[PDB]
Design a protein around this ligand. Structure first.
Ligand SMILES: Nc1ncnc2c1ncn2[C@@H]1O[C@H](COP(=O)(O)OP(=O)(O)O)[C@@H](O)[C@H]1O
Ligand SMILES: Nc1ncnc2c1ncn2[C@@H]1O[C@H](COP(=O)(O)OP(=O)(O)O)[C@@H](O)[C@H]1O
Ligand SMILES: Nc1ncnc2c1ncn2[C@@H]1O[C@H](COP(=O)(O)OP(=O)(O)O)[C@@H](O)[C@H]1O
Ligand SMILES: [Mg+2]
Ligand SMILES: [Mg+2]
Ligand SMILES: [Mg+2]
Lengths: 165, 359, 359, 165, 359
């Protein structure tokens, strides 16, 4: 418990990602597929990392596989919080669930790993309704599509983002 | 875009009308510490909290916890605002009329749904099989029902209820797996045993012959890998667990099996329609998904019925979610949009509007 | 010292002539494993054995099991040797003549009674009320009879039978108590529900008005303590269970209620005696013991009969055992000792002697 | 199952107590109201405990309350089988039923309690027709008239031995 | 001269029929180097060998090691030849039928006993208390069972098993004694802690009140001398160790305490016999020997049961070996010599003779 708070900009983005409102196809393209969170400069709040996001309208056009381009947004030597909206299919249902991703690479400095880990359980309590959590401590634990599929539903997951595993 | 919610005794099936499968299938449980967790959240904590089923035997008993499940369904599972979508609900057979009005009141006042509709689960399963007359054997998690239906209407005096379903079979498999030296007692280990049951258990056509086959070789033994990598082997427990559906005395119950319950409810119908019910016995629910259960039901009911009757057990391949799938096909029809109970009609007639619009 | 045995469809009443009440009242059931248990012994085992009623609807259907009940009656319940006492038996209305001779043969050859007599149950109830003309509405456990009697003789063409009595009301109370969340399914729990029925159920004078009173307050709710100390509460089920006597459609039956059955059997009698039957309607049996049933029968038959007829329902306070009490008063009379069928008369005329000595 | 047999003297006494035969008032006074059974010296049979019995002719003369004097016959530190002929009255019938009583006080030696308990279900099978059984393991569970009345018919019992409860 | 062997989950009790106490009480362990040591021999080596329980939770899991214990029992402990004495064995509740036949085969073929008999442990404890109906709470070394018994027969659907007994309490006392600065980790130091547990531990009637008494004075502190003369002092650990029987969360277990397990198994029985089970709760085993455990069980079950039920906990002073003592009294009866399974009967029927002669 480090006392780091969650900014209102992060709470607003999470509330907009969780519940889908009836909207025109133009506003549907502006929905966020993935979004990164980082510490502020004074390290007092969790804020939105500007420019590091994937929109639903980008998927199928500029973005071919949304999970591969999301993994590319993760910094190599810095910790990050991530919100990924996973579209997957099991043997008896097509699912759409939010995944909270804690990115804490071993190459990150010790001060970043300590602050992000000691404040993770407080931000995840503010983001109520998330049922999937992926703790990745190296690039090999996050880059593989089958690692996410195992966390979503284990071996029941037969497809991820409209593509078979 | 309508919502279809199948409120099961142990599992909540929810999704969007027009889809082939429900989007969300989660346990209908509310957990409180030994402050309130619903669904998979209540099972992620395991042993700290005590779990309660608000709709334990198909009938809602705790309406405060039932609103928590519906709130969890709309916002966390379906991820929609219920005030923007009409909702089709399902109900168990012999559901009292006070519960139908309570559901209508909660949907219009607590969630502010624009439209609403209530359907009987067994009738949706019979329609999904392409029938308007027949008897539905719906075996779920907390309750088993045999519902004879004539021309689209369930015969309420002939509906039989059996408090023996998948939940009792999971507890019985945990009990007989301890005879092999394994220990499944905790809440997390109960979810493992339920997964063993749904993957390796089957109904034997001849139980005593199958017990002799399992005692003379190992051709019936299967291995199962636990979440921590440990491998267990299961032998005659594969067919001894679902055998309690036909011999409830394995559980210490005095009741009849599912085959005799089906026969007894056919014998409570008019003699002129019993021949049609014998040939139109439709299986429904998750507990009817054991391989070999239709051939066993066929053999058991043939021994109870007169030899001149044609016994036909219908086990459609999509019978696990036939209630939800039947509801999603119905709610997605453009001709069905006149059948909804609007909020305008509710403001005039009150919650009693459900009795004349949904029967 | 004569014995009086009232063979009921569900309950056997036995005792000694001259006593005010029967000494033994036990269920007329024979239980065999799913080797032979009779009476309360068959109910002490609960679910291991299957139970059979040898006289399920007033008429003996299984004479082998009926001899087991009579043997249990004499030696275990009355604790006497039947070869030392004359026995007065009772019979249901419309009992076939082959059954009367079979009873006489069993009593003289199997039990070696010195004397014997057969009486009609409904005629004993009418005599016990101080009447020789009237219609007896005898509602017991397995069967309900409306028996119009003129000058001491039952009119057989006007006797109506209704397969709706206390046994069906117990099963219906078990069914509607599950709507409150309680579970009564086993044989031991059926005896609990029968005790709830005999203590808390009553007949509402106006059913729809009573349903509104029960839905607006809790002044009609009663608590009941189970054998294990648990307390249940019962509300409108108190008057909904005996309401099936007047509305058999609550049970899925097409038949008429007990009020219309009484009216229909009066209308099958001669027009000249119908006025006397309207004023001499006598209730009899355990199922007529609900508080408020005489006032309800009075109101229902008044609505069916012409307004110029005087409707009088007679509900004597001792009408539960009026058949047995009437038989024990009759069998204890010194002037009645000439009416017995002796074993000497049986050796000469055979079992057909019962038709001319007991009519 | 200890294999302890029931003597023919006990079977004869039970058959005479169960079925009442037409007899002169002199033989009616010789009927047994209560009787105790014990083990033989070699512990091979259940026999009649000599002198420990109540006659029907004694009731109303030397014996005022037959159940109170019956409880006095039970030994304080020894097990016993008992046959009591209860005359009670419910709300709608006057009844006369035999009650089998297993007296096994806690003060009794362990060897007596074991042999009487392991042979109880075999003697009770020979005494066919008994529908009431009272297992008393202390003096407080047998001395009270309302304890017997509860076993006979619960709260329906309004009188016992001609006296209200 | 028959032999009585009580095969416990952690301790083997053996002796001669007719004696008041077992002659040999040794640990049922087989030790092999980290070539085979049994009993106290396996504990005399301490840390060189690894120890295995062949009957760890009452059910034999390793039949090769179980024969080593029985061989050690006959020749080293009882010092007799088993081919000259009939042997009475005991078995845990819910023992599978394959294990009963395996015991019969080993006794007649490996040890060549002239006669043999198998008894249920809980039924012997109930008989020893002078009862045929009741619920036995048998807490031993590896397992705790609540066994409701009606008329001498255990009700198998209501038997509950708790993997929490004296072995887990010894490990917990070792753990909390390290909070005072003592170090008990080795196998020899575990036998010291078990001796501390059996001499100084007790059950507190009110745990939180007892924790306050121990924190404000030293009237609850006791001294204990180790085998090497060193003296340790123990305070609130005296009642914190057996408190885990009622609060298994002290051990990280999700299960219910022994009081709730007893209550839950009574609630799995017929409602008509629950009143008799509440008044006939009998304690059995070594783990029920703590002072104050009967008064604590009485208070805890009273809070769970309805207030109209009479709760009576029976804790006989010889309840530690009531299974063995009940078996030695039974096996020494001259009338019992007809109940043995002879070797002649075994040669004809095979090992399945045990199911019809010992049930
Ligand atoms: N594939 C399967 N094979 C055997 N049993 C199954 C299978 N799937 C589910 N079951 C059981 O079916 C039960 C739930 O099925 P369901 O029809 O949804 O019940 P409900 O509607 O009452 O909630 C569960 O107890 C589950 O374990
Ligand atoms: N006091 C009561 N109040 C309401 N119903 C009762 C009462 N007593 C008995 N009943 C019912 O009456 C039935 C038996 O009555 P009875 O006249 O002896 O029938 P039968 O002669 O056919 O055996 C039973 O079903 C019993 O439950
Ligand atoms: N006097 C005692 N006080 C408290 N606990 C005891 C006492 N005696 C034994 N225990 C414990 O009881 C356990 C063994 O008792 P036992 O009934 O023989 O179990 P089992 O039959 O399963 O082998 C041991 O863990 C022992 O430590
Ligand atoms: Mg269902
Ligand atoms: Mg009658
Ligand atoms: Mg033990």
């Amino acid at each position: 418990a480090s006392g780091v708070a969650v900014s209102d900009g992060v709470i607003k983005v999470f509330n907009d990602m969780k519940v889908r409102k009836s909207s025109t196809p133009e506003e549907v393209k502006k929905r966020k597929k993935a979004v990164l969170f980082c510490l502020s400069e004074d390290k007092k709040n969790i804020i939105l990392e500007e420019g590091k996001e994937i929109l639903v309208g980008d998927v199928g056009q500029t973005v071919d596989d949304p999970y591969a381009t999301f993994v590319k947004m993760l910094p190599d030597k810095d910790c990050r919080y991530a919100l990924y909206d996973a579209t997957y299919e099991t043997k008896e249902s097509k699912k759409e669930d939010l995944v909270f991703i804690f990115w804490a690479p071993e190459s990150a400095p010790l001060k970043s790993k300590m602050i992000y880990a000691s404040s993770k359980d407080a931000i995840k309590k503010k983001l109520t309704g998330i049922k999937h959590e992926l703790q990745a401590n190296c690039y090999e634990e996050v880059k593989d599509r089958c690692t996410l599929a195992e966390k979503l539903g284990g071996s029941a997951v037969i497809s991820l983002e409209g593509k078979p595993l | 875009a309508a919502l279809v919610v199948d409120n099961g005794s142990g599992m909540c099936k929810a999704g969007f009308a027009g889809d082939d499968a429900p989007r969300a299938v989660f346990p209908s449980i509310v957990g409180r510490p030994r402050d309130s967790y619903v669904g998979d959240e209540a099972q992620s904590k395991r042993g700290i909290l005590t779990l309660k089923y608000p709709i334990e035997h198909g009938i809602v008993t705790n309406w405060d916890d039932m609103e928590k499940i519906w709130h969890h369904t709309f916002y966390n599972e379906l991820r929609v605002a219920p005030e923007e979508h009409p909702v089709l609900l399902t109900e168990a057979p012999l559901n009292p009329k006070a519960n139908r009005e309570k559901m209508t009141q909660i949907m219009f006042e607590t969630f502010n749904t624009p439209a609403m509709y209530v359907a009987i689960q067994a009738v949706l399963s019979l329609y999904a099989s392409g029938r308007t007359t027949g008897i539905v054997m719906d075996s779920g998690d907390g309750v088993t029902h045999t519902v004879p239906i004539y021309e689209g209407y369930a015969l309420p005096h002939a509906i039989l209820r059996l408090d023996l379903a998948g939940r009792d079979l999971t507890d019985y498999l945990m009990k007989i797996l301890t005879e092999r030296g394994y220990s499944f007692t905790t809440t997390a280990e109960r979810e493992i045993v339920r997964d063993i049951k749904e993957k390796l258990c089957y109904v034997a056509l001849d139980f005593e012959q199958e017990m002799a086959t399992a005692a003379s070789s190992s051709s019936l033994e299967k291995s199962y890998e636990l979440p921590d990598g440990q491998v267990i082997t299961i032998g005659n427990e594969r067919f001894r667990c679902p055998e309690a559906l036909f011999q409830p005395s394995f559980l210490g119950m005095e009741s009849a099996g599912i085959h005799e319950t089906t026969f007894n409810s056919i014998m409570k119908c008019d003699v002129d329609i019993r021949k049609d019910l014998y040939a139109n016995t439709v299986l429904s629910g998750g507990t009817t998904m054991y391989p070999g259960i239709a051939d066993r039901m066929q053999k058991e009911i043939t021994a109870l019925a007169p030899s001149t009757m044609k016994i036909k057990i219908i086990a459609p391949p999509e019978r696990k979610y036939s209630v939800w799938i039947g509801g999603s096909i119905l709610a997605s029809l453009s001709t069905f949009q006149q059948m909804w109970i609007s909020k305008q009609e509710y403001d005039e007639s009150g919650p009693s509007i459900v009795h004349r619009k949904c029967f």
